[PDB]
Every structure is written in C-alpha cells, then in structure tokens.
Amino acid sequence: KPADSTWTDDQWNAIVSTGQDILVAAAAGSGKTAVLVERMIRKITAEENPIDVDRLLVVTFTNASAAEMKHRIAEALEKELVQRPGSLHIRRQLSLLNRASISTLHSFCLQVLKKYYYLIDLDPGFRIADQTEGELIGDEVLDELFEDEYAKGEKAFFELVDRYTTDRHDLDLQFLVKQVYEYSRSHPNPEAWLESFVHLYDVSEKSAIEELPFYQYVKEDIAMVLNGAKEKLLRALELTKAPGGPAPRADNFLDDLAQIDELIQHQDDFSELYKRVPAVSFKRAKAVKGDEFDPALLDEATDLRNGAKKLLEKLKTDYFTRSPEQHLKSLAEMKPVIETLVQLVISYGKRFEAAKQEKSIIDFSDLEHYCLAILTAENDKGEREPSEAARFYQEQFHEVLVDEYQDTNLVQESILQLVTSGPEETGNLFMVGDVKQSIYRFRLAEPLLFLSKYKRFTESGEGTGRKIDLNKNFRSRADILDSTNFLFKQLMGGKIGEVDYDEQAELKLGAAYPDNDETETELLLIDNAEELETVQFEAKAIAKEIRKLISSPFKVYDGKKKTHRNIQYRDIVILLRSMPWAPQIMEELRAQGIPVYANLTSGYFEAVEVAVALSVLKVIDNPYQDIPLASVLRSPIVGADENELSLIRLENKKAPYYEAMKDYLAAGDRSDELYQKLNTFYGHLQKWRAFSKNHSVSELIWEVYRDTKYMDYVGGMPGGKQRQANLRVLYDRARQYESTAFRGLFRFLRFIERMQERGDDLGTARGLSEQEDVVRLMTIHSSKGLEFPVVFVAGLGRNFNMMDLNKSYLLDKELGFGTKYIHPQLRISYPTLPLIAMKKKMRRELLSEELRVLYVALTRAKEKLFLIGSCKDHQKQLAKWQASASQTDWLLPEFDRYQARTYLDFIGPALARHRDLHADISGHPARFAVQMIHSYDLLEKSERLEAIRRGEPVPGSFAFDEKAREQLSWTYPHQEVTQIRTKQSVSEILYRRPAFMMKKGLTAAEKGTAMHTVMQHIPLSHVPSIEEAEQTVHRLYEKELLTEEQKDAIDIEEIVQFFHTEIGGQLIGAKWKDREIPFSLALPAKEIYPDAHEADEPLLVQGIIDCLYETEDGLYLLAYKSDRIEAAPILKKRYETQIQLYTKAVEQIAKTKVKGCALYFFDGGHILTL
Amino acid sequence: KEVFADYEIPYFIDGKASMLNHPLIEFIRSSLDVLKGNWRYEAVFRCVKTELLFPLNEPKAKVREQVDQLENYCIAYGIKGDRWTKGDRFQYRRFVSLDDDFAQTDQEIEMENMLNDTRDWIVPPLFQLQKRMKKAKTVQEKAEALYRYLEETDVPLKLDQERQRAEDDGRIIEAQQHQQAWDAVIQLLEEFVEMMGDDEISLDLFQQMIEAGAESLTFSLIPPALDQVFVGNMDLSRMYGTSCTFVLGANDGVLPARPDENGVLSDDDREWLKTIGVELSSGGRERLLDEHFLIYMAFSSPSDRLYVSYPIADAEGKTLLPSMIVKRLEELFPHHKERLLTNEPEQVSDEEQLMYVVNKSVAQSFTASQLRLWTREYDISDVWWSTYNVLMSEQDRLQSKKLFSSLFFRNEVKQLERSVSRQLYGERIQGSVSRMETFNACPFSHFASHGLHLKERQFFKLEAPDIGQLFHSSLKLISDRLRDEKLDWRDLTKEQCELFSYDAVERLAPKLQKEILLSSNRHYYVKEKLQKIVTRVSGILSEHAKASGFVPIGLELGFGGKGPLPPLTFQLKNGCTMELVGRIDRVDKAESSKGLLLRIVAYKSSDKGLDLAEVYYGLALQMLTYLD
DNA sequence: CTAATGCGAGCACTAGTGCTCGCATTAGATTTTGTTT
Ligand SMILES: Nc1ncnc2c1ncn2[C@@H]1O[C@H](COP(=O)(O)OP(=O)(O)NP(=O)(O)O)[C@@H](O)[C@H]1O
C-alpha cells in the first residue's frame, strides 16, 4: 500500500514490501537502519493484524549496532504509544520489548544453546569462557598433544616440526596450529575445510599450471604488471613527443614496448613466459645531449623506463627463476607434510573441545557452531535439513531482520538460513547493508555473499528475492559527501576495492543544511623537518584544531526536526584504524583540558599502582619473592628508601630478601623509624596472610586498601583519578574472576600471571562514562552504523598491517594452506607457486578492504571532517603524488593503487589533481583545506602547600569549620546495641563424627527426647500401669511419633514412677492442665546487657515449657530432665535461671502468679522443688 | 558489606553466604584434585595453603614460610606426580654452572633438609588418602576414606583452635562458621551414603557429586540485631514499620527484570499445558507483568522517605540504561529534581560536599583527592579545608600527614650514604664487565641487581642464557677432546663433527637447568636440535680454521679470579678498589710483518656485532675489554 | 621493503674516457579490526 510520508519511495518500498526475501542495498547514510526499524514498528503497531515484538528476530553482528537498533525501536515504539495511549497492544509491546529477540547473532546463539542443550553434548549450566581462560586451556591441551606426538615419535611428525620451527625450540609450530585452527573456525564445516588442504598439493609433472585453481591469481598478477609496464613505457613514449622531451629514446621505448607486448601475447601461457620473461633485455638507453631537452623530462622518462625494468625483474624472480616442472615438483613434494599438519590440527580441536566440555565452558566460536549443530538434523555436504529446534524458530519468527548484512559470513548465513521460513522466492528474510562497508575479512565475511544475492534478485519481487536500492543520503552536509565521492571515484574500483564506485554508488545529497563557512574538509599533513613520537605531534594538531572549534563556537543542526544545539565535546569524535595510538592521544588531549573517552583493552598491568597492588597480593601469597617484596617496601605503602633497603640487605646477604627483613626486625630496636615501617608492614602481612585463607580475593583486596590507604594515597598523586580507577577495577575484576574459575588468592594470581606470560592484557580503567560529555576515541570498525557532527581520522601515514604476507605460510578461504617449500635436511626454502599466488591475492584483498575501511570512516561525519597523517618530507611526497597523477581518468592506475602501503598513498595522488592542492576532476564541488604543518610548530611559594607539607593546619577561617568538626566527632547514640542479637535463647542467657562411622543409635539425647515424647503424650486422666505406658509408647510407635530405636530406648518403670510421686498426683488432680507450652518473652536489653536504653528494643527470649497445671492453691510449673544422677544443689543452680525465665514468662504474659516449681529426673525418679 | 563497613553502617543481609571461601571446603576439593590430576602443582599447593595439613601445634607463621620455600622449589624443579610419592629425597642446588662441580655446601644441605622435612609431613596424609580411595569401590568406603583423611590430619582440632582465635579477636560470627562448615560437610557425606552408599562409583563421579554438593553449601543467616539497616530483595523480603526505603539499581532489564526461561518446560509448554487444564508455575509473560506489583510494594513500603536510584555504568565502564520507572516517576513528579551521586565531590554543591565528611577515614580519602585537584588550580570547596584543619587538629594527625604527602610524591631515590654503600658493595667491588654495563644502562637496575641481590622467581624452563652456556661448554669439550687426540679443527670430518657434538651435548645435558633436557620427550627433541646446531658449528669452525692464519691461544680463558690472566684493577678515591673478573671466549694469535697479532672472538647467539655508539655509552664493553 | 654505497664491466662515443648497467650488501625501517553476561 502506498502512503504519504517523509520517506523516500525507495524507503517506503523497503518498509512495506513483503512476500519474499528482501535485500536493501544502499550507500552510507541512506536510512537502511531507519527503514529496518520503521518496518518493525509498522508490523507491530498495525490496526488490521498486529504482531507481537517477540515474533521477530532482529539480528546484527556487533553489540553496539544491536544496542542502536534496540534504542531506535524503543524510541519509535513509545512514540507510537503517545499517538494512541489507549491501546493495550502497544503497552503490551513495550513490556514484551524486554523479552524481544533483538540482539547480536551470538546472543541469539546463546539463547538457542540454553534452550536446546540436550540436543548436543552440552551442560545446561554451561558458561561462556573469557578470552584468556579459554586460550589458557587451549595452551594446556596443545602442550599435552605435542608431548604425546613427541612420545609416539612418528617420522611424519618430526618431518613437520623440522620444517615449521626454529633450530632452538618449537613454539612456532604451536602458533601455527593455533592459527590454522582459529581460521578453520570461520567455516561452516571446519574439518572439511581442513581436509580440503591437500587438494592444492595433489599435482604431478603431467599437470598443467594454468588449469589449477590457484593459477587464477597468478594469471591476474602477471596481467597487471605487464600492462603496468606497458602503461609506463607508453608514458615514456608520450614524453618523447613533448617539446622538452627526448625524441631519440623513442626507438628504445618502442623496442621495449614490442618486447613487453610480445610478453602480453603469451600471458596465458605460463610455460612460454618462463622462456621469454627472463630472456628480455632493454637495449642501452640512447644518450640525449643538448640544451634543447628539458632536464626534468629526460630524467622523468629515464625513471619510467627503469620502472618497467623493475616490474619485469620482480615478475621474473617471482615466477620464472624456476621451471614450471620444478615448481610442480616442489609443490607435490610438500604434500605429505601438509597431511600431518591437517591431522595435527584436527586432533587439537577434538582435544580442545574435550577440555572445555570437562569444565563446562565454551568459546565465542562454540556459540555459532553449537547453535548450527542444534539447528541441523541432517547435513549432506552443505544441504542442511532443519531439526525440531530450527522448526520452532521458523514458526516463532514471522520475519528475520539483519542489519549490516555485509558482515555476514557463511556460518551466520547457515544459521539465518535455518531460522528463516520458506525459500528465497517466498521467504521472511529482510537484510540491509552495503558492500562498500564490508570490513570483516578476518572473519571471512564475504562481499561475494551480498553481491551474489544482489545479482540474483530483481527489482520486481517475482520468481526470486526482491532487491531495493536507496540513492539518497540524509545524514551529512554536501561538504562530506563531495569530499568522499571525489576521493573514492579515484580509489575504489572493481580490481582494487572489489566494488565499482559508479554513479549509482555515489553519495547523493538529501539532507538540508544551512551552510557554514568552515565546514570544508581539512587535511593536516605533518612533517619531520630539521624526542616525541609522531602520534604525539598528530595529537597536538588534533587538540589544537578541536580548541579552535571550541573557541569559535560550532553549530549543531538537529535537521531531523529543526533546532540548533551548541557544540559539545560529545559532538567531536576521533577515529583510528587501531588503538595502540589511542593512549598517547588521550594523554595529550587530557593535558589540554579536553575530556577523552576510549574503550581500551591494553596497558593495565604497566600502570605502577597495579604493579604495586599486585606485588602486595603476591607477597601475601608467597613473601619469598624478592622483587615483589622490594616493590612493596619501596612503594608508598611502606615508604622505605634506597638506604633503608640496602640496610635490610646488610642483615643477611645470601638469604632471600624476606629473610633479611625478618632478621632486621629480630635485631632492630623499636626506636628506629625503619623498624617501625617494617614492623607495621610485617604485622599487616601476617594479618593479610591469615585473612586470605578465609575470605575471597576481593575481600582481601579491599582489606589491603583499607589497611594501607594506598587507593586513597594514589588519589593524591599526579594522575590520581586514573590510578584510583585502576585499583577500583582491580577489585571488580577480582570479583568476576573469583566467581568464575579462579576463586582464592593463589588461583587468582596464577591466572593473572599466566595471562601476562602469554602476552594477554587488560585495558586501563575508565573515569568518565561513554554517555558523558567527552571526546570519544574509537576504532573505525566500532563506528560503523553511527554518526557524528565532527570527525577526526588520524594515523593516515600509518602502514597497513601486512604481517600475514611475510610468514612461511598463508591461510586462504578458497585455497587453504599455502607454504614455502622447506627442506629440513638440505637447509633450503623458497616459496611455492600457490604461496606467491595467495600472497598476491591477499595483498589486493587487504588493500580493497582498507579502502572500504576508509569509506566507513569518512562517511561517519555529519558536518565536519579532518584527515590527519604524517610523513618524513612534504616536498618529496608531493613529488611522488604528482608523478602518479597526470592521467585524466578518474580511477588512478591499478598498479599504483596496488603499491599503496599507507592511507596517504591513496588520498595523496587522489588529492593531487585538485585545485586546492580537466574541469570534471578539478571542478568537482569538493572543498579541501590543506595545512602543511611542521612537527615543531605544534609544540614561587604557596602558604597552603607548605602548610600541608609540614602537616600543619592551614591558617584561616572557613564556612564549614564548625559543622565539619561536629560531624567528625559525632557518634551514633545507640552504637552499643547495634551488635546485640535481638533473639535470645534460655541457654544463651563439638565436631561430631558421621552417622556411618559410629555404632547403632541410642545416644543420651535420643533416649532423653524419646522419654520426653512419652511424657507429653501419656494420658493424665489417671495413674497408668506399666502395661498402659507400654501401650501409649506403642501407639506413638505406630503413629510414627516415635521411631523403632526410639521405642526400644524406653525405661517404662522410670516414667511410671513419676505418677506415684506427690507432684505427679497433684498433676493428675488439677483443675486445668497443659503440656509443651511455647512462649516468647520480651526482656528490655538492660537486664541482659549493661548500657542498653529504654528506647532500645527489648530482646526476645524464647522457649518451651514442659508442663503447667492449676489446683485450688495456685498455678504450678513442671519440667522433665534426663540428667545423669545415680547432686541436688548442683541441679538446682544448673536450671535455676531457666526456671526463673519460665516463671517470669508466666507471671508477665498470663498476668498470674506462680507458686512452686518442680523438676523431675528420670534417673531414680527424683523431684526437686524451686 | 565493604562500603557499609567503611561508613560504619550496621546492616543485615536477607541472604545466606557461600561456604566456598572456607579453608575446609577448599581442603576437601583440592585434596580430591590432588588425587584426580595426579599431584599437579596447582592442586597440591591449593591444598597445602589452606593450612589444614600443617603439623599440629607448630607456629603457623613458621610452617607457612617453610611451605613457601617448598613451593618455590617445586616451581623451580618442576615437581609433580609420583615424584611426590616415590620417596626419592628432594635434592637442592643453588647455582647453575656447566663448568662447576656438583658438590654441595653447608647452606644447601641445611636447605635440602628443610625442604624434605616439609615434604615428609605434606605427602603421607595425602598419599594415604590416594591409597584408600583407589581401593574403595562404593560411595560409602570413599566417604569413609575422605572422612578418615579429615580426622587423621586433626581437622576438627585445627578448626576449634581457629574458632577460639577468632573469638579472642572479637570476630565471633567468623568463629561460628567453622563448626557450621564441619557440620555441613558431615551432613553432605551422610546423605551421600544414605542414597548411594552401597553403589559402586568412580572417583570422577564421586568428585562430581562432592563438588556439586559443596557448591550448594551455605552459612546460616546472621541473627538480626536490635538496630541495623535491613538490606534485602524485592520478591521475598518482608518488612514492617519501615520509615525510609532505598530501592537500588532501577536499570533496564533489571527492574522490571527479564524473566528466566531456564528450565525443562518452556513458556509455550506451560502456556499450552495451561490450556488443557494443567496448572503449573507462572510463565515469563506473567512474571514480567507481576513486576509492577513488586515495584508497587517496594515504592509504598516506607512511611516517611523513598529513594529510587540507578547506576549509569557498570564497574567496567559499560553503559547502563535507566529503566522505564525512572521516566514514569518523572511523569508523576515533574517538578522533582534528580540528585546526582558521585565520588567526585567537586561536581555537587558545598552543602552536598559536606555530607561526605562522615568519619575520619572517608574524610581522609576524599580530602586527598580534593588536595590533588586543588593543586590543579581548582577552587575546591571550603568543606575540604575545614575537613583538613580538623584532621590536623586530631591526635593522630601524623597518619593524615603521611596520606597527604602524596601531594608532593615524586619517584625520588635517595643516594646511598658512604657507610651504607661501602658496606653493601664491600671494600673491594668484585664484578664483571656485565655488571658495569648494567650500571651504564640504569644505576637503579644495578642497585636492585648487584646491591640488593634481588632474585626473580625461578622456573622449570629452558631460557636463552642456559642454551648459550651449553653452546660454549660444548665447543670447549670438543676443543679439549681435539687436543687430546692430537686432532685439529682442520682435520675434522663430517662424521667426526657429528660424533663429538653429540657426545659433548650428551655429557652436559644432565648438568643443564635441573635436568630439564631429560624431563620430557619434547625436551629430548630440543636436545637433538641443539646437537644439530653444535654439529654444523663444528663444521663451520673447521672450515674457518682451514682458511685463517690465526690459531687459538686460549678457549674460555678466564681473567682475574683464580684463572691464568690477572684481573683488571681500578683505584677508586674512597680507597675502595674495583676488580673486574671474567672469561674471554676465544683469543687468536697470528704472526705478521707488523709483529705478533691478537684478536678476540666471542660466541654469540645473535646476528649483530659491535655498535660503536653503544661502546661510547658503556653498553657494549666486553670485547674491547678482552682485547685490552 | 627500499635506498643508498661501492666496485667493476661494458658499450659507445670522440684507444681512453664517459656513464649506463649490473651485482651485491648494509642500513634503516615498522608497531590490528570483532564475537557474552
Ligand atoms: N527519509 C528521511 N528523511 C529524513 N531523515 C532521514 C530519512 N531517512 C533517513 N534519515 C536520517 O538519516 C540518517 C541516516 O540514517 P541511517 O539509518 O543511519 O542510514 P544507514 O543506511 O543505516 N547509514 P549506514 O549504516 O552507515 O550505512 C539518520 O539520522 C536518519 O534519521
């Protein structure tokens, strides 16, 4: 149904369209997420047939994006609630929003495991391990496996080890297995992918190179460099035509061309290239002499020709220093080694899973894979049949919505395909995303998955899935869109970038912004001309410009609905590729009053407070560690100086430092200051020592802080806020780890130690929350899907992380495991053809993604964009930038873009042809502000202070003196009774052996209670005989009021004797009788405790009176005792206070007097009166 | 618990506390782990550190120290498994020198005795438990084994003593919980044998059941006192006559709480079972709806005052969102101001900063921070100057003074006094080029290393220096053997190189790093690797000898000490003398027209050579010293 | 990687002397993205 709105027709299309799988493809800021939300809201708040929120699955990959969707859905939902406050449905939905399935796909996976644990080998009470504890378990099993393999001593294992390890140790093989395993975990069927390794090595001498899959990437490479060389020479040829240009060398170049063209005719024949490429020679350059030739032009042509040479020699050394037959031979020779690796990795995985199952924990990886295992019933090589659980979720979910779909790998796609209902042609899958923002190649998130569906689908929803393009941007000012577009028309292509940045793909203005004078995109290039790391210079430039934006106020347009907002620090955001630069940036920005926030994951353990507090914990665990002990002693916790330290050492040179400390204490006199330090500390040590064995780690930590005031102290030194923060999270992290698998000091410390020992870290604590008004530093990945008024992008001169390209092996999704030929005995190694192939493939895949990463970064901005980078020399780099940009096509040369190592190698030459640094290119509506910054340009006595140093009060009068004084002297009026237990027992006013270790029953208490039961149950109408007593006992045995052993432990004579007594007779003959009388009595606390108060609550004393009877004389109390006798003054005082309690209870509560009390003892039938 | 301890607020928790921190439970669990994992390091010392194995009536502090040193020994020597139970006396050496002799010292003997004496009371009760347990087939006899293990080690008496120590120190609540622990354990065992006593079960499952049962164990409720704050929950807690109520953590997902569908029957199951007439417990939908009643009862529980608070961030910094009831409250009371709660007093009014000064410790804590902030040119409230002055008028102003000395804290070191330094390094500094290089890197590092002799904790692990010593000593052995057989490096064949390298490494392997090269199959291979290296090196040296005019005069030629060459002496103005002693790797002589020529060759396990810059700054001084 | 250093060879110019060509080695350079509660 068509409806009037603010929505674009394409958007409305995506909101209302239904009936099949739907894919919405659109550039950044198009409203893809907005549309997803509104689609939901419309499905929920409908009049005809509304659905509940829990009938939708709304999934994304990142926790942040899921938080965003959750946020938008909530807002929109209650917004709809305002419009119709009467509906029960909408309020119901706002309640259900808690139980709604709106999260990460991993969170959903957790839900699946929790419900359907019984379908797989999983404990219902399973827990998700954290990174380090999981990886530690992995380390253990890997060590165990390796030892087992060394024990077997199989030749193949040694053959593998010898090749992928050093001459001294085998750690590299360890890292290899870890890496291969981890990579395999991104495939829907890891072991199958591993088992597909060898097919790459299954060649022979009779094979044809060009018919092998990997050769594809070889084929491309050659084609690119040869053409790249041709393209170079042609320019050297065109330069011969220029007025200054050197005419003669034309005949040289045309020869070279003819040779290079000769190579191009045989690009598809590798075996022919092997003959021709190493046979190519460029004839000696003809000398051009005279003043007719431009010098620069001569040199320029020379440079280009030499470029061609280099390209060929690189090509030759890469592929043609070995015959194709030899390449195939080395490859095939490597096959057995690969098989051993595969079986090794497979064993590790199996053993690894076993280890985790034992401790009932799982990876993040186990989330996806176990979820997939649950959702499948039958699995025929990819064809997965939905199990019962899958069918449940298919029914439960009416539609599955996926945002940022370009981050979906094949595993997640498997899961979605199992939870969706119907085929593609009639499914309930709704996905939005953008191939240009595909930036998770390390997760095997494939652009190909998006692109395939996009090519299969049609704009009409007939016969297949429906695809919907959105062209309009509603997020940024035209400054940003234009700078972006101008940059990526020149950088992102199909070859490098993997995406054609055509007109359909360009950003198109659709948001109305009242112009500003300074909104032009800035480029700050910093130089190293004429002891600060370059990140610091960069950070200075950032901070300077930020304060420039603060000094001249900035205007923030709430274009969504019409209102201005003054710029807050909140509005500015710094984006980085990676966070190792972040701390040094934060320090400099904090040093300039600019509030900074950043979610860090490293640097925690190098903070001195942490090293110190940890040292304390270690010393408490084991004082016989010289370095932690010395650390604690020298720390402000004790404050021993270097002299006092060496003084401790002098008492005992050979022994441990702890021994020496003990000796100093043993010999020192209590008048020494050093003695006092050490004695106080030692007392604390012993106290903490005892403490930790009875309390948790966290209680210990707080107690340490309490006794040392180290956290307080640390709050008073430079960086106090951060330091106190660090100690605080030491406590909280102790809390979490205690609760998980590392309870107790020894286990905790061992965990921390093992964590650091394998290079794992934790982030420094944070002070200001993310919500607060702060400049946020974050990764470009984290920012995906979000928007900010101002955006800095820093570290553009930083090299791309290309470490993977330099190892002896390489992992490839398509091709598997490529490696060098290695011979452990011959001591030689060289790359095989598939290794080179994969290296080329990987390089261009990496560069493509880095390009996309940049696109995400630049498209984050709403109004302002800053590009900051660093180089050695301005002029030299500008020369390099212009020497690539003379071409008139938008897209820069493939080979040149392929050669990029930093972001500036991209942005540079793309910016060169601009006016600010062909009316189509230079007359682009893009405005760039270039600053060519240099590194260098970016860079008493107080009465109270001395009063504080002297330990003296500051002189003066202050408004809060009297109140501070009174509050610090205050004590709680009722302090004394705060620890007094309310409830008290009459008694109040042994480590037993187990049952199965002792003889058969019949104890004193047993028999005593067994008699007491009879006394309270024997009829009191008349005096009973032995027979009647035995009869009562028997009835109590058949009512199960008395166990068999209880029954047999009865002295009938002893109880019958009581009824022959005087008190017993008077009991039988009474007006009124009662037994087993429960009572509670309220005694004012002063009576039991001195210092109580009339206001202070009474204590409650509780007990049970055995018997009470009333005659014509008064009320009498009776109690039974099984006390050993066969003694009267002793028993009298033994129960005196108890009897007084009973009497006072009766007197006070019943408001009646009590005349005479009696205690009957079964042994000998004694009766004493009180 | 902690915060209210600090602010001196008495409380009662409407909830029982876990026993999992008690020494008894950990003793039982870790003992079972000692049996199951075959005496792993972590299990054994988890067990020992609970101190219930400690010899009766021995000084806890002393026993502790002895255990500590045994622990360091077990880490250093990789002690695990039947190595504990075999009886083979633990042997102890202080220093690793491949050249030196094995012979022990007085100290090393004394130490070895101490280590073994500690071992001999640690192993038997544990080993006996391992015996009985293997023998026991049914649940009851394993329970019998465990209990007798507790009884033989005198656990009841140790607990009793502990309890009395706690009572004496006024920690009565902590004192009762020991008996509670024993009784819980005994009950657990009792029920175990009552249900499954005669059934034959495996150690694995027996440990599983003991573990689960222990994981459930809980201490009794602390009995209420006459005057405490009641801290409890919102579904079970009951109160009467409440005047002021603080409702905590009004966060989204927490209050109202997301229901837990954990259980065998799902919401759909319960719903459908409800439709067929079966009434079970509530479902997620219903519980989530009933949350409003719970909230209502909480909000309407006090008579005078109601506070509703919520945190915006978790302890890790992650954002926490307000629950809907905060907005609901803003609606019902639109002119009510929301209060801020922060530990940064400079963000609230003076009057609100004054509320922070509740006692000496808290006031000290905050005053320190405020003083720092003040030195950052912030006009801190007068609250804190008043607070400061009171703290300085107090009788123990010295403690606060020490606290506020943090204001002027810089990591300063005091230069050593003449007497002390002289006494520490001695009258005559006996050192090596290595030591001088350390000093040139950082004087403090030299102080910690050669002044305070701070040793780092040793591990059963093959590091680079040890390998280096192996290489050096190996080449030496081969060299001496070559002179013995009238052979020269030139006259070595491939077969000979391999044989000599193998034999040399073989000799040195037992001496290196507490026999670690013999400790595993993985290490056997490391050993073979090292042998391959020595072999190739022998070959290379052989080739070089055939092409050099230099002949080695001396190999591992010691200077100073008691070796051939005399030391390099220096006269220091204090009268203190500095003597540098060591060992040159190789010295070569060669005749020439210029005269006699000497060169120095060093065997390095690295690729780089000599940096003249490092020589200038005294970081690389060995080679030129040897040449000198 | 890449950029500089030096040493030796040849090819070409108008036999010696210039300068391109090629080889081989140090020297300096560089400092990951996410998934739970
Ligand atoms: N039709 C519209 N009219 C006005 N504003 C709109 C419209 N559509 C979207 N917006 C706004 O434009 C901005 C961009 O929307 P958004 O949903 O983030 O697009 P996006 O495709 O998800 N961006 P990205 O995730 O980077 O690809 C948001 O502030 C939307 O509220």
Ligand SMILES: [Mg+2]
């Ligand atoms: Mg989006």
